Amino acid sequence: MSDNNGTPEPQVETTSVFRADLLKEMESSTGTAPASTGAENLPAGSALLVVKRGPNAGARFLLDQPTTTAGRHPESDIFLDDVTVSRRHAEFRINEGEFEVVDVGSLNGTYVNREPRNAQVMQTGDEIQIGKFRLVFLAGPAE
């Protein structure tokens, strides 16, 4: 039997099949492994943040404003926590030498990753927990 007997059969039998819906993997955030986490990792003058989820915006924002105060009142620079509003939640400030993030009185609590910090050196790459919501501060353009 020259025919049919020489048919390759697929090994590794799979009867535990599922529907191939076709999940398409991709990336959108800049996540190339930082060569030297220092001055060349960090941005120059301006920096950026992405909102990982929150009523504050839920988008990505550029900070080139010397002092950006997070509140929720018409006179506040940016709107932060809407559902659980502290009059003065947090304040993101960019300084000619360094980046600094200060809690100005968030009742929900401002935590860096999982660390309670009322003042923190603003780090690019880590996520700032604003109450329950999630904001990530990243290194903006060094260009």
Curated annotation (Swiss-Prot):
Result of altering residue 14 to A: Inhibition of growth on glutamine and glutamate degradation
PANTHER family: NUCLEAR INHIBITOR OF PROTEIN PHOSPHATASE-1
Every FHA domain range: 68-117
Gene: odhI
Keyword line: Cytoplasm, Phosphoprotein
Cellular component GO terms held in the UniProt record: cytoplasm
Annotated compartments: Cytoplasm
UniProt-recorded name of the protein: Oxoglutarate dehydrogenase inhibitor
Role: An essential component of the PknG signaling pathway. When unphosphorylated, it inhibits the activity of 2-oxoglutarate dehydrogenase. When phosphorylated it does not inhibit 2-oxoglutarate dehydrogenase.
Entry superkingdom: Bacteria
Signal peptide residue numbers: none
InterPro entries assigned: Cell_Proc_Reg/RNA_Proc (IPR050923), FHA_dom (IPR000253), OxygluDhInhib_OdhI (IPR048204), SMAD_FHA_dom_sf (IPR008984)
Modified residues (Phosphothreonine): 14
Main location: cytoplasm
